[PDB]
Symmetry: C2
């Protein structure tokens, strides 16, 4: 109130002055119920909005009990608070907080500590073209803003019946995800789930859709602390095929699985679907770069006498890029691989005697996944789920086979084996040490690039003057995690030299207190270590080597 009145009076003087004058507002202001922080002042009304932060001690909120709930329960609480703040702030468009659509992410928009709750958001400072409108600014910052900050962080001001439900569904999702390993499962699709979305350009669920039901033969029942027992499709470890004719729901099922690496909000249709957190969907990429990667397990020969054990390029082929992606995922410690025959290189998937008859000179044939996929399971315990409907030689090595028909799952593993007996149709899979990363070389990119670090949506990531294409990483949900990826790189750049295990280093940097070493931005979400590597594997300046 006193510091607030100090700001009010200080803000009145800025009336009709140049927009540059807002720089004087920069600083901390200890209000009555909270501390207000104004970190970055935009230099233009039409530029990115000014960043603000607000802190509230647990004593004044009536939500101290949240500290004694599970980390997942608190994850939802933080998400619910951000959405509540956004809802109360609809009538004031100058205020904006970073939301994550249908998912619940570990975001910086709302953070918990031992001291209290922290809110991070933006405030588009007004003006009459360029001259400052103090009276409007006062109304936003000293009248409206304080109300949204309070209402969003006061037990009674929030809808508790909706809060508990929100936190409970997220807690259940984490609980269900933790017991996948114990039950020898890599994914779980609860009965009653709504898999299809309204359209291809929208992540919301389709209304009036055929609800999912699992075939008893492949049915499992998990237990959530709030909802209790939940029955659904249990996809066991190993190789699992998703077959069926065209337009029957194979991709829709796989899409739900690939996205179940994240938690979803209630009513989304997928909030009771969980999948191995490290599951990586691989597809064919055109034009990507690959750094000193060993592809001996898949590619045997290359033109221009290049080393298959130290493959490097700035314009990768289809089968080459997918093979590289595959190896990169193993390197990063992925337990599950997702593949869709409709978005992959046929050459890389299957073998063919036809082609090998006329291309049998000095070009040794590539080793297709079908020959290695079995070894990935038996040797590395890596599961794989594949949408097919085209080839059939995979049916032999598959553990389970699911058929989609009129948008319902059917267990056809038994009949699948019968087809092989009626009509029937090798080298050791080598594990390699991870490539070392030149952590200090990243600093050079920042210096030459003015320490620029930002994301343009989900597809691109700018690190200095370098732009990284992340289009292929379709599992990514928000640009917030892309920004976070860039700020992880920024931290890697602070280290002395080379690191012989980057994935491990990245994992340790994001060790629960992942946000403390990043700038205090409100548009950041914890990214997966495997995704940081994936993005880094596609950065054209990245320096990797082989301690071999």
């Amino acid at each position: 109130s006193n510091a607030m009145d100090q700001l009010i009076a200080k803000l009145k003087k800025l009336e009709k002055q140049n927009y540059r004058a807002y720089q004087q507002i920069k600083g901390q202001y200890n209000f009555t119920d909270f501390d207000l922080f104004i970190d970055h002042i935009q230099s233009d009304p039409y530029a990115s909005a000014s960043r603000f932060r607000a802190f509230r001690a647990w004593s004044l909120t009536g939500l101290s009990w949240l500290k004694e709930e599970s980390a997942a329960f608190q994850l939802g609480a933080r998400d619910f608070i951000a959405r509540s703040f956004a809802e109360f702030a609809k009538q004031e468009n100058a205020i904006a907080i970073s939301l994550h659509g249908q998912t619940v992410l570990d975001s910086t928009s709302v953070l918990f500590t031992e001291e209290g709750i922290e809110l991070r958001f933006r405030v588009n400072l007004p003006a009459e073209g360029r001259d400052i409108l103090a009276k409007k600014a006062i109304n936003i910052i000293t009248f409206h803003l304080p109300k949204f900050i309070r209402r969003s962080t006061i037990e009674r001001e929030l809808d508790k019946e909706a809060l508990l439900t929100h936190c409970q569904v997220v807690e259940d999702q984490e609980a269900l995800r933790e017991q996948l390993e114990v039950n020898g499962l890599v994914s779980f699709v609860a009965n009653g789930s709504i898999l299809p979305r309204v359209a291809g350009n929208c992540d919301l669920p389709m209304k009036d859709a055929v609800e999912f039901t699992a075939p008893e033969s492949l049915q499992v029942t998990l237990h959530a602390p709030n909802r209790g027992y939940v029955t659904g499709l249990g996809i066991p470890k190993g190789i699992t095929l998703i077959v069926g004719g065209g337009f029957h729901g194979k991709s829709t099922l796989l899409n739900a699985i690939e996205r179940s690496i994240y938690n979803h909000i209630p009513g989304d249709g997928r909030e009771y679907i969980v999948t191995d957190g490290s599951a990586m969907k691989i597809r064919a990429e055109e034009g990507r770069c690959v750094h000193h990667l060993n592809l001996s397990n898949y590619i045997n020969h290359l033109p221009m006498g290049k080393d298959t054990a130290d493959f490097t390029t700035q314009d990768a082929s289809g089968s080459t890029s997918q093979a590289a992606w595959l190896q990169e995922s193993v390197e990063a410690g992925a337990s599950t691989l997702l593949i869709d025959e409709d978005t992959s290189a046929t050459n890389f998937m299957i073998r063919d005697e036809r082609m090998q008859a006329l291309v049998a000179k000095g070009d040794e044939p590539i080793t297709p996944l079908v020959d290695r996929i079995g070894q990935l399971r038996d040797e590395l315990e890596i599961s794989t789920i594949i949408v097919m409907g085209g080839s059939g030689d995979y049916l032999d090595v598959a553990d389970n086979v699911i058929q989609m028909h009129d948008y319902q799952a059917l267990d056809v593993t038994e009949k699948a084996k019968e087809v092989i007996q009626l009509h029937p149709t090798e080298a050791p899979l080598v594990t390699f040490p991870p490539r070392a990363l030149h952590c200090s070389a990243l600093m050079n990119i920042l210096t030459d690039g003015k320490f620029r670090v930002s994301a343009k949506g989900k597809d691109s990531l700018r690190f200095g003057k370098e732009f990284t294409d992340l289009s292929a990483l379709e599992q990514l949900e928000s640009s917030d995690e892309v920004n976070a990826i860039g700020w992880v790189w920024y931290q890697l750049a602070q280290h002395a030299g080379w690191n012989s295990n980057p994935a491990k280093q990245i994992s340790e940097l994001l060790g629960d207190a992942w946000f403390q070493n990043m700038p205090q931005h409100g548009d950041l979400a914890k990214p997966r270590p495997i995704d940081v590597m994936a993005a880094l594997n596609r950065m054209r300046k990245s320096q990797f080597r082989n301690n071999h």
Copy 2:
């Protein structure tokens, strides 16, 4: 000079006034050597730059002779003039003209008429935050700009030896493209061409690359009016396969062909490669919409008892989207189809007895391209070029087979036939009337969307409140043609009602004087009729019907 002095004096008065004051500059100004047009004044220094236009009669340029050259020769001249103007204007970044990288397009940045040469460009009006800097504005508009407008449109001021060469290569490209049909060819790759680019994110040519050479067995020699006789690879009509092991240059060859639908600048490496102008590369799309399209020739059965002759959706499958794309291309009159096995649905390409054994209930099997591709050639005279390296059942119906090895073409058609004899393995392809378009329904989108028409790069096109995803259309070169696509739609919206042949209508709208009915913008390039349809086929609000 008099009208210029009028502007100068009129511009001085605007010193230190609000940026809004620039609106008074709007209008025409008859300078000494040209007429200056200031069409749209930006409302913010940080918003899209103000649009300008300049006109110069042929008498004052010394380039009247260009009017007696071929349309293609003039196409290059217009391109060369735009690049010259950009070069002279490097020291003045406030000025900008729309260039098209490595291609030569029919653009609005530089237009010819019977009266004279017209230049269209932007001018970022300066200010000290918001207050107008007249002195700077004067320097840009009355001192620098007039010099670039003159120098770029005066025979002696330009580099003639470079001008002629530029216009000659383009003229040769058109000449070579026109004699493809006569020699029963769909594409021509001249010997000495450089196909690979520096990288996947750059369209410039790779230096120190293995130059292309055609195998005599499949060699042809065309004739250009300037360069004379040129020998290279002649890809005849019908089905042509591009095989070989991984990382040998199959996509690079196909990529050069798909992009040869446009003319390229000298030294680009592809300026002597031509391909059927209507060639459409089809691939698998996820989530696209499809409007009342007949897929009877490919899809036989669908769930939920849907009509295969009137297929409609807002979230299309892989094989479904590719099949739809295929049919849509035939509808639009495409003579050549480009396919890459690494970016396509395997299910859609090949047949398989394996899968049909366990998915043989009420789901009739989809008819794969391999069964129809032959009919497309024999019945519709539609050629197809396919990069394979995976499947081998296509070798049977193929006319010619090219093998890439160490980045050189080899004719393996003879050996390809031998492989089939040693190991060997139907319904009529129906032609349909084109879908009618509800031209007037487009007007409704404009009214509800504030007549908004713009493109965000090459990937997106905004028409009112509707956003169209054009990512799959990888053949597109510039956002200028995407803008042009939107302005064609704008014209379709002016018509009374339904049109039973939209492709024909679009073709007639772009009849050489394509730019006269579009706003006088400088960032527009003539798009292909097939591309306008392609974009329109993916607009979720488009209304198509079947007069059947």
